[PDB]
Structure formats: structure tokens, C-alpha cells
Amino acid sequence: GMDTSGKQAEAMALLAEAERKVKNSQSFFSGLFGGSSKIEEACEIYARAANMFKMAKNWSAAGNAFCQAAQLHLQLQSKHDAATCFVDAGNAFKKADPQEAINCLMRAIEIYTDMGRFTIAAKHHISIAEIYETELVDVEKAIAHYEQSADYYKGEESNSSANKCLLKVAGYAAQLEQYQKAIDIYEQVGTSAMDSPLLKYSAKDYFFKAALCHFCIDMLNAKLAVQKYEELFPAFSDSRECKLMKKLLEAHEEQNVDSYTESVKEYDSISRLDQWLTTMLLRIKKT
């Protein structure tokens, strides 16, 4: 559009003016020692240019301008503002491609943890984990980033966010065919949840997840785990999950595959299944 073209032209002119100003800043400093006002003005102009590019919807140009402002302000020893500008650059890159966002967030986390800003460092670690999950499939790196973010959050005593990260990590791990860690995390979360009445209800889902994870090992230990959960949380029997696992165990006792399929279909009708649930059921049916 004509308006978009005009905005792009204005942004290009402002970028050229900023380039001229930053070029002349060194000459002015050498010839007069006017201070660092030129660098701050250049950073402000770069931020304005990034805003105009966002007007025109240009992610790459806005990210480049934000990076230039970040480095210019870092040369000014203003570590906090430099980290903020780097975070803005990473956010801008997230729109198009987070390739630069990885290093931007790494530097921001380092700067923030140097001074003690642990909450923002943990949030940036969460952002890195999300970027890795959406771009790559390497779960382990996302899990490690989530643990680092949780550690940073506990460092500031800011809860209610690390717990969700740990729960998501456990959910991921359950799909990676690892038993000890996933079961330990699920049981810890469940026993923590029973004490709180609000979260006590959610403990049943984690108990069912742990029972399913231990069921792949063998029927004998699966029955022991089910009995342990029942004794610890008898009310778990009221939930449909316990009925489902008992039905699966009974069907496997006689290898009644049709009964297992009927039970799975009935459970799906009662509540729509999930990818993890379907995968676990298919794996269990293998034995």
C-alpha cells in the first residue's frame, strides 16, 4: 500500500540519519569530548526506527535496529539497559526466526543473573525452552532449560511458576520412556498436592500417569503400584482413571484384546483422549 511504502521510506531515511549520527559521534567525541549523549540519541533513533519497521511489519529490520541500540548502549557500560535492548531484539527476532534470539536470551540471562535479577533470567530460560521446543524436537535441552529456570525461580523465592515448569517437564519425560525420574516427579507432585485441598483433585491424574508409566514394566509391579496408590489415596478409586487401569489389568490377565479396545473406546467417549494417553495405551497393548 501507499501508506506502507511511505512508512518504509521514512524508516529507511531515519536509519540513514542514525547511521550518519553514529558515524559522526566518534568524530565529535575525538574533537571535543562531548560525552555519551550521541550514543544515547543514536539508540533512541534506532528504537524509533524499529517502531516504524513494526509499523511496516518488518521483523528483520526492527531486530537489526534493536541489536545496534543494544550494542551501542552496552558500549556505554549501562549493562541493565543493554540487556533490556538485547531482550527486545530477541523478542523482535522471535516473530521471524529465533536464531539470534538464542544468543540474545543467553546474554540477557547472564547479565541478569550477574546482578541478581533471577526472575527475568528464569523467564528467559523458559522462553529459550519454548523456542527450542517449537523449532527443534530435542526434548532433553528443553527439560534442562526448564530445570534451570525452576532453579532460578526458587533462587528468588518466587513460586507458582517453577511448579508448572516441573509438571510440564514430567509430562514430556513420561513420553521419553524413562521410568524412575518421571515416577519420582509424579509421586512428589501428587504428595505435595494432597496437602493442599485445591490441588488435591489434580493428584489423581499424576497418580494415574505414574501407574501407567509403571505398567509398561510388568503386570506384577503395576498391581503393587495400584495398591500403593489406593492405600495412599483411597479416593482415587472414585476417579475413572483407577477403574480404567483396573479394567486394563483384568483384561491383560486373560489377554482379552476386544475387552481392552471396548474399555479404551468407552473412556475416550467419556473424555477425549490425548496423544500421550493413546501412545501409552498402544505401548501397553504391545505386551
Partner 1 sequence: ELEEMQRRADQLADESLESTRRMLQLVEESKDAGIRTLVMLDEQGEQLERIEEGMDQINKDMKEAEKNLTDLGSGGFIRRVTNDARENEMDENLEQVSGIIGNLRHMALDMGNEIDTQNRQIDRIMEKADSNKTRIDEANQRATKMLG
Partner 2 sequence: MAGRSMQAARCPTDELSLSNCAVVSEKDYQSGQHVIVRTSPNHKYIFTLRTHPSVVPGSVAFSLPQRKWAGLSIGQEIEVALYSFDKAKQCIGTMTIEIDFLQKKNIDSNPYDTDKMAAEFIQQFNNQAFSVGQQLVFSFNDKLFGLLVKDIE
Partner 3 sequence: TRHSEIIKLENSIRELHDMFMDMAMLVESQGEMIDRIEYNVEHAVDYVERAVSDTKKAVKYQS
Q: Which ranges in the chain belong to alpha helices (H)?
A: 2-32, 37-56, 59-74, 79-96, 99-115, 118-135, 139-155, 162-175, 180-195, 197-200, 203-215, 219-232, 240-254, 257-270, 275-286
In angstroms and rounded to an integer, the radius of gyration of the C-alpha atoms of the chain is: 27
90 close to 128: Cβ distance less than 8 angstroms? no
Q: Which of 202, 237, 256, 259 is close enough to bind partner 1 by CB under 8 A?
A: 202
Q: How far is the CB of 218 from partner 2 (least distance, A)?
A: 6
Q: Which residues bind partner 2 (CB under 8 A)?
A: 217-218, 220-221, 224
Answer for which of 2, 32, 198, 220 binds partner 1 (CB under 8 A) is 198
Contact string 187-226 vs partner 3 (x = CB under 8 A): ----------xx--xx------------------------
The grid coordinates of residue 44 equal: 533512541
In order of 131, 215, 255, the CA distances from 286 in angstroms are 34, 12, 11
Question: How far apart are the C-alpha atoms of 124 and 129, rounded to whole Å?
Answer: 9
The size of the interface with partner 1 (CB under 8 A), counted in residues, is: 12
For residues 193 and 210, give the distance between their C-alpha atoms in angstroms, rounded to a whole number.
15
Instruction: By CB under 8 A, tell whether 80 contacts partner 3.
Output: yes
Which CB sits closer to partner 1, 3 or 157? 157
- Minimum distance between the CB of residue 197 and partner 1, rounded to whole angstroms? 6
Residue 118's nearest CA partner among 162, 86, 77, 81 is 162
* 157 lines the binding site for its own copies (CB under 8 A): yes
Q: Which does 114 bind (CB under 5 to 8 A by kind): partner 1, partner 3, its own copies, none?
A: its own copies
Q: What does 283 bind: partner 2, partner 3, partner 1, none (CB cut-off 5 to 8 Å by kind)?
A: none
Answer yes or no: are the C-beta atoms of 143 and 130 closer than 8 Å.
Answer: no
Residue 113 contacts partner 1 per CB under 8 A: no
Q: Please state the φ and ψ torsions of residue 157, each to the nearest 5 degrees.
A: 60, 25
Which CB sits closer to its own copies, 205 or 249? Answer: 205
**Taking the complex as a whole, how short is the minimal distance between the CB of residue 51 and its own copies, in angstroms?**
5
Q: Which residues bind partner 1 (CB under 8 A)?
A: 158-160, 164, 197-199, 201-202, 269-271
Q: Which residues bind its own copies (CB under 8 A)?
A: 47-48, 51, 54-55, 57, 59, 91, 113-114, 116, 151, 155, 157, 197, 200, 235, 272, 274
